[PDB]
């Protein structure tokens, strides 16, 4: 079964690490951090890895139930919630995953909305449940962020109107802050089971192996609740590629596919890249920053090569 990529321009792609459109292709050869994100991880033959799942609505989302209001030193009102799998089934910590699928894979203050629809209905309102929603922040670096143990903590500006024991949804929107005390680092994994435990069942780190090559990312800019900043989230492959590879499950005929970024109008190749078996791209480039390319461009599979193939310089 021939390997294929979908035919989608950057303007038709979304980020696999946060619910955002892809804005630009991006490189940063001098990156000092280990790149080991857990969302948007899929092998070329269709095996999802890390915390990766298929739903665009599931990325950095949580489902569960608030247990109670809790105490925390930080400003705001704090709440504990148990989390389930996104499909509502109980999360089994013995499963070979780092955390419930969809769990955020970076350190920071994730801003979004907590909403609730009560289980109990009220006769005075046509047997319909009561509802509420409020802005919320989940600090993934907090010792109380323990999704692999089945519960996390979120804060609200709202001081009162969050109900205990009721079905609860977190819809991610952006970051609360990227100032020094908000610990935003897109390549630092949360400690899924708490302070000082080792994460397990991780998708592997990724890196170029050929001299002169660097990782190529699909970059999205992420909204901020407040403060100064222009934060971005870089994924290895867009969510549509994860979805495509999963559907196709085409056998990988080598460890590296040669792909070309093409301008369909001219038919000309804008640059070429290596698409590695574990599900990431490298290019021959010696600079950091956006890849300035025609809007109509997209990657096309060329052939299976090997790790010694020399890419044409971007």
Ligand X SMILES: C[C@@H]1O[C@@H](O[C@@H]2[C@@H](O)[C@H](O)O[C@H](CO)[C@H]2O[C@@H]2O[C@H](CO)[C@H](O)[C@H](O)[C@H]2O)[C@@H](O)[C@H](O)[C@@H]1O
Cβ at position 174, least distance to ligand X in Å: 13
Rg of the chain over all Cα atoms, to the nearest angstrom:
21
Nearer to a copy of itself, 190 or 238 (CB): 238
Residue 277 touching a copy of itself (CB under 8 A): no
Q: Which of 40, 46, 64, 174 binds a copy of itself (CB under 8 A)?
A: 174
Task: State how far the alpha carbon of 188 is from the alpha carbons of 39, 105, 150, 197, 269, in Å.
Answer: 13, 8, 21, 14, 35
CA distance linking residue 142 with residue 158, whole number of Å:
20
Q: Report in angstroms the alpha-carbon separations of 140 from 99, 241, 306.
A: 12, 26, 38
Instruction: Say which entry of a copy of itself, ligand X, none residue 14 contacts (CB below 5 to 8 A, set by partner kind).
Output: a copy of itself
> Residue 70 forms beta bridges with which residues?
78
Q: Which 216-235 residues touch ligand X, going by CB under 6 A?
A: 226-228
Is 310 a residue that touches a copy of itself (CB under 8 A)?
A: no
The entry of ligand X, a copy of itself, none that residue 312 binds, CB within 5 to 8 Å by partner kind: none
Contact flag: residue 165 with ligand X (CB under 6 A):
no
Please report whether residue 20 would count as binding a copy of itself according to CB under 8 A: yes
Q: Cα separation of 129 and 13, whole Å? A: 37
Shorter beta-carbon distance to a copy of itself: residue 183 or 225: 225
CB of 7 to a copy of itself, least distance (A): 6
Closest distance of CB 175 from ligand X, Å: 12
Size of the site for a copy of itself (CB under 8 A): 49
DSSP state of 247: H
Those residues whose C-beta lies under 8 Å from the C-beta of residue 260, and which sit 6 or more positions away, are 269, 270, 271, 272, 273, 299, 300, 302
Give me the torsion for CA of 287, 289, 295, 297, rounded to 10°: 40
**Is residue 229 within the footprint of a copy of itself (CB under 8 A)?**
yes
Stretch that binds a copy of itself, among 9-17, 43-51, 76-84, 263-271 (CB under 8 A): 9-17
Residue nearest to ligand X (CB): 226
Binding site for ligand X (CB under 6 A): 130-132, 161, 226-228
């Amino acid at each position: 079964k021939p390997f294929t990529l979908p035919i989608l321009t950057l303007g038709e792609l979304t980020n696999s690490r946060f619910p955002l459109p892809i804005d630009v292709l991006y490189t940063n050869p001098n990156e000092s951090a280990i790149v080991q994100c857990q969302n948007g991880r899929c092998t070329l033959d269709g095996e999802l890895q890390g915390t990766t799942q298929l739903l665009p609505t599931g990325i950095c989302a949580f489902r569960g139930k608030v247990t109670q209001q809790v105490q925390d030193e930080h400003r705001g009102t704090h709440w504990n919630m148990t989390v389930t799998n996104l499909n509502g089934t109980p999360f089994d910590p013995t499963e070979d995953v780092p955390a419930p699928l969809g769990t955020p894979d970076f350190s920071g203050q994730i801003y979004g909305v907590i909403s609730q629809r009560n289980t109990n209905t009220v006769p005075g309102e046509g047997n319909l449940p009561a509802n509420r929603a409020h802005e919320a922040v989940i600090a993934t670096y907090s010792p109380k962020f323990t999704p692999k143990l089945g519960n996390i903590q979120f804060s609200t500006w709202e001081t009162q109107d969050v109900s205990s024991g009721q079905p609860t949804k977190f819809t991610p929107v952006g970051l609360a802050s990227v100032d020094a005390n908000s610990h935003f680092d897109q390549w630092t994994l949360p400690s899924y089971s708490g302070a000082l435990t080792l994460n397990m069942n991780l998708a592997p780190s990724v890196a170029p192996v050929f001299p002169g090559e660097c990782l190529l990312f699909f970059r999205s800019f992420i909204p901020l609740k407040g403060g100064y900043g222009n934060p971005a989230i870089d994924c290895l492959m867009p969510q549509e590629w994860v979805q495509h590879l999963y559907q196709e499950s085409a056998p990988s005929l080598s460890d590296v596919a040669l792909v070309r970024y093409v301008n369909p109008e001219t038919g000309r190749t804008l640059f070429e890249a290596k698409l590695h078996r574990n599900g990431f791209l490298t290019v021959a480039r010696n600079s950091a920053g956006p890849v300035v390319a025609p809007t109509n461009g997209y990657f096309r599979f060329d052939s299976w090569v090997n790790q010694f193939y020399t890419l044409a310089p971007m």
